[PDB]
Every structure is written in C-alpha cells, then in structure tokens.
Design a protein around this ligand. Structure first.
Ligand SMILES: Cc1cc2nc3c(=O)[nH]c(=O)nc-3n(C[C@H](O)[C@H](O)[C@H](O)COP(=O)(O)O)c2cc1C
Ligand SMILES: Cc1cc2nc3c(=O)[nH]c(=O)nc-3n(C[C@H](O)[C@H](O)[C@H](O)COP(=O)(O)O)c2cc1C
Ligand SMILES: O=C(O)c1[nH]c(=O)[nH]c(=O)c1Br
Ligand SMILES: O=C(O)c1[nH]c(=O)[nH]c(=O)c1Br
Lengths: 313, 313
C-alpha cells in the first residue's frame, strides 16, 4: 500500500505538504522541504519586492498551537520565480508558489510573469486571499466584492489553472456566498481551507503581557485550536464546490488528524504549526500514521474515504 | 483581598457567572445557579414562544472544548419574565435575562414587556445578537446594518440600560465597524464577548461520523479551542468602547483564564463549556484560584489589573 495520487495533472507521492509560510522562505528552506518526504511543497507568500515583515517577537508556539503576525516577510517575487524556473527539482515533487500582493494590481503584475514559468515547468499558483497580519490590509476574502475583483483580474492576466488560500468562515451564509464567488471562476481548480484564524490574542499570565510585538499582540492562530474550524471549512467548500479540489490546512499534528481532513473532503493536507515545531521529520511520521489507520479500517486508497464523513440521519 | 465589584448599579460578590445557555433553562437550573457561589446568573436565551430546539445529539464535549447546535430550546419568554418578576431572590445575586428573538419585531415585543420588570426588580437585559445555530438565520451581528436596526428598535422600545452578546470577529476592520455601531447606542452599557465560534465541525475518527445531528454536524465551538479568540475580542472592544463595560466569555476553566480575561478588560467573567462539564462547584474553585493569583502578585482588587494587559514596546 502506497499513498500516491494524481491531481491537477501532477503526480504526488502522498497528500502531505508544508503550509505556506512554514519552512519555505529561503533557498535553504525550499531545498529542505524538497529533501523531506512530503508529497509537495509551497513557497512563502511573496510580494513584488522583498519585505522584512513585522518586528520581533512575531511567532510564538504553545501546547495548543501558535500565534503569528509575521507581516509577510519574504525575499521578493523575483527570488521565488527564479527558484521555480531554475532551481527546483521537479523530478522530486511538485511545487506551488504562493503569491500575496497587497493590491489587485500587484497580484496581476506577478501572475503575468509567473504564467510563462507555469507553462514551461508546471509550477502551481496558490493565490493568497487571507493574510490577517498586515496593518490596514484586512483579509481580501472577507470582502466578497474585493475577492471577485481579484479573481476576475488574476484569471484574465494569468489564463491558467490556479488555487486560492481562503480564510476561515464561521457562518453558513458566508460559506454559501464565498463558494458561489469561487464557482464563478473555472480557472480556480483548488481551494485551500484554511489560513490562520485571524486576530486572536495570547496573553502570558506571569508577565501580564501579550506574547507577540506587532499589532498590540494580535495575530493569526494555528494548531490544535483551529482543527474543528478547519474541518468545517474543508467540508463546507467540498460540499459547495463539486467541480474543484479542496486542500485541507489547519490543526494537523497526526495521521489521525489528516484522516479527518480527508474524510471532510481534503485532497492535499498541509501542515503549518506542527511542522514549524517538529521539523520536516514530521512527514514520515504522518505518512506512517495515516497508512496505519487506513490498514486498520481496510481502506486501500484515499479515494475510498475522501469526503465520506458521515452525518446523523 | 477582594473579588467584589459594583457596576450597572448592582453589587456583585465576584465577577463569575454562567454563560447564557448553560445551567439556566428551567426553574431548577436557575435555582441551582442562584444557590452556587457565582456573582450573578443569566437565563437561557428566550423566544416569545417555547421551543424544543434541534434534534439530539446536539451538544458534545471533549478535552479541548465543546460543540453545540442546540437550536434555541427554551421555556419561552413568559416563563423567564415570571422568573425575574416573582421567583428570583435578588438578595442572593443579580439576574440577567437573555433574549434572542428571531426577528427585530420579536425582540421588540419582548423588551416592551420586560421594561416594567427591569424597572421594578432590576433584572438586566442581555440581548443576543449572535446565535450561530438556527438554520437560515445567519447571525445578526455579522450583518452590521441588521445589527444597527436591532439596536435602534430595541433602544427605542426598551429605553433602559442593556447589554449585547456579540459573536467573535477575526478581522481588525470588523472590530472597528462593530464597536463603532455599538458606540451609536448610549443605552448599551455592556458588551459580552464572545458567543461560540460558529459553525465548526467535530469528526470522530473511529466512527467516521460527525458528533452532533443538526446541520450536518456543524455547530458552535466553546472551551479551550476559543480562549485566544475570546481574549482578542474582549480586548478589542475594551479598547474601542471606553464608555462601556466588557464582559468576558470563552475558554474559562481556571482562575488563570479568568485573570487573562480581566487583564484583557473584562468586568464580569462568564463560564460556559467548563460549567457544563464540571457543574456549579466550579465557581468556588475559580474564586479560590483567582484569589491565589492576586495574592501572589500583590493585587488587592480587580480594578488594580482590569484592562492592564501589557503590549511590547
Ligand atoms: C509562521 C507562519 C507563517 C505563515 N505564513 C503564511 C504565508 O506566507 N502564506 C499563507 O497562505 N499562510 C501562512 N501561514 C498560515 C499557514 O499556512 C496555515 O494556513 C495556518 O498556520 C493554519 O495551519 P496550522 O494549524 O497547521 O498552523 C503562516 C502560518 C505561520 C504559523
Ligand atoms: C449548550 C450551550 C448552550 C448555549 N446557549 C446559549 C444561549 O442560549 N445564548 C447565548 O448567548 N449563548 C449561548 N451559548 C454560548 C455561550 O454562552 C458561550 O458564549 C460560549 O459557549 C463560549 O464560552 P465557553 O468557551 O465558556 O463555552 C451556549 C453554549 C453552549 C455550550
Ligand atoms: O504574517 C504572515 O506572513 C502570514 N501569516 C499567516 O498566518 N497567514 C498569511 O497568509 C501570512 Br502572509
Ligand atoms: O443553539 C443555542 O441555543 C445556542 N447555542 C450557542 O452556542 N449560542 C447561542 O447563542 C445559542 Br441561542
């Protein structure tokens, strides 16, 4: 039994990958994720020009998960493009490139230049509509008219299949509306649910202080805190977008957690906080553990249970 | 060393109370909360007519918290009004009455009838703008125009100080807008943050099934999952509504959690999931544990640290 699968005209050894932003900012990082046993990797969300991001401390982890307001620190689109065009070994695994421009115009500018490299090399675009940590720039996908504009302009400028990194929603009417926007765009072939649960606040009792410096301590939550929210969103979009793929992200620490994402509808499963904390060795453990649950249940393939979560009556 | 507070023209032995919906639906529940060591109590959110609610199982709890889609089961407004009017012993502690009509008109109908009782007895209204579990009713506080309508109509019909039960937000722009809305209404004297993180999905790996029957398993999350979300919303409104009180709710299991809430700006501190799981004995524990933290830190009263969370730099 092997976990290999085919999606988006690519082959994957297993459904596991890093979550964007974790272990993927530098050439070193990307070579490390390439050398891991993950089935694919995704680059750090990038902007046209390099960014240092927010002041430190900007990430902190706890038994139940993490908080971050990194502020989109990255090496600049030129670097990530060059990685995709010249440095990545596509014979090892597929690559996704995350773009996170701060305006529609900035995203269009990047996608116009990524297009030829996607045609030549097969690198996959993940368009980030859900950064909750840049001051004065609220999450795009929480403004449905802004989300539609971004997806119109990118689709026209890019002209090739791509995916979108979605924020979590918490209301059935939101799920309905967000999915109907996505469904207006046939080039959106995958939807990654979810980005961090925005603007939580961790406080240290002893010091009486917030734990990250930017935004008065406010930052996106990841980890054990967000698994039920992540599952809800994966299933919501999997139910509402029957002609698109859903990639699960949020709260994955174990094979058992990945099993639930896949039951909810996930095709790929992305690992953020747990990867940041454990390191790339987590991928061999996740694979071993998912295989073991599958064996105990008699499943031979992922397709046998993907999206097959049961409801009561 | 002292847990006493005085606000809204009432005196409280301590800041703890039940979160609406937990241990407060029947006369029995209400007498039990009255006999406990809580500083106050709040009744089940009510509608004009009695309601059975959703099918069972509709609540489930786990180590990291709870999921519920109760469906607003309640004995009806006439019962909670009579409770406030004839049955509650106000010499024991103050009473809040939660109202959660399904339209502005239902709300107005109720508050017109509550007013003379609030005047005579000193019962305090908590208006629920955040139920996430009645199908086809996306929560009022997520539609800022609807929210404004509700508050205008209720202010005009009720004409007395009241408070509001708010959903969590996850976007700084939403904090800004919601608080600005609330700031329009001078009769809104307190803001309870937060209701359950809406429409999460708990899935049992062994049975491959969702764990609650209603809404295909989608329900509101409470407990450990939500503490940093709750602290963020408490602080966001504390900072934005300097002329109002903020009551904290979400993730309180310990005196330490309560301390964090209070640091974040909370006046009263409500206990939902942990109270449902542990029972009303929790209140003596939370009091002892909060007093222990205060003593270690040299704090003699709540106002010495309320709202004094430190930020970095
Ligand atoms: C340090 C850090 C940086 C991240 N950077 C990005 C990013 O650049 N782009 C993005 O789409 N999401 C980013 N995220 C969000 C993760 O991709 C992911 O959606 C979120 O952390 C939830 O998954 P988890 O529960 O496995 O952490 C970041 C998360 C962390 C903790
Ligand atoms: C079984 C149950 C019933 C609830 N009913 C109500 C209610 O009637 N009205 C309301 O405003 N919130 C209701 N809530 C939400 C709680 O008041 C509270 O906002 C939420 O559970 C988060 O607090 P916690 O983390 O302490 O559970 C209910 C929660 C549960 C678990
Ligand atoms: O602050 C980050 O860089 C970051 N952090 C997140 O949690 N999600 C994102 O999309 C981004 Br771009
Ligand atoms: O389903 C409920 O009764 C319920 N459950 C919640 O979590 N919050 C509410 O406001 C309500 Br009214």
């Amino acid at each position: 039994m092997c976990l290999k699968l085919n999606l988006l005209d690519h082959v994957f050894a297993n459904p596991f990958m890093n979550a964007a932003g974790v272990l993927c900012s530098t050439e070193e990082d990307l070579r490390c994720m390439t050398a891991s046993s993950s089935g694919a990797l995704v680059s750090k969300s990038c902007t046209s020009a390099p960014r240092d991001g927010n002041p430190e401390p900007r990430y902190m982890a706890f038994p139940l998960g993490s908080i971050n307001s990194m502020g989109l620190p990255n090496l600049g689109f030129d670097f990530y493009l060059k990685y995709a065009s010249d440095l990545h070994d596509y014979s090892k695994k597929p690559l996704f490139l995350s773009i996170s421009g701060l305006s529609v115009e900035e995203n269009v500018a990047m996608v116009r230049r990524l297009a030829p490299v996607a045609q030549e090399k097969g690198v996959l675009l993940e368009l980030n509509l859900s950064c909750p940590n840049v001051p004065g720039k609220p999450q795009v996908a929480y403004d449905f008219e802004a989300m539609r504009t971004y997806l119109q302009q990118v689709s026209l400028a890019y002209g090739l299949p791509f995916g979108v990194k979605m924020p979590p929603y918490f209301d059935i009417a939101h799920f309905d509306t967000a999915a109907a926007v996505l469904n207006e765009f046939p080039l959106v072939k995958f939807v990654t649910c979810v980005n961090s649960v925005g603007n939580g606040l961790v406080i240290d009792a002893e010091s009486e202080s917030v734990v990250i410096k930017p935004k008065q301590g406010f930052g996106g939550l990841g980890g054990k805190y967000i698994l039920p929210t992540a599952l809800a969103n994966v299933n919501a979009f999997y139910r509402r977008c029957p002609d698109k793929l859903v990639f699960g992200c949020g709260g994955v620490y174990s094979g058992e957690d990945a099993f639930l994402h896949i039951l909810a509808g996930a095709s790929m499963v992305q690992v953020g906080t747990a990867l940041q904390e454990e390191g790339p060795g987590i991928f061999t453990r996740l694979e071993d553990e998912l295989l073991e649950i599958m064996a105990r249940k008699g499943y031979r393939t992922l397709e046998e249970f993907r999206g097959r979560v049961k409801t009561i009556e």
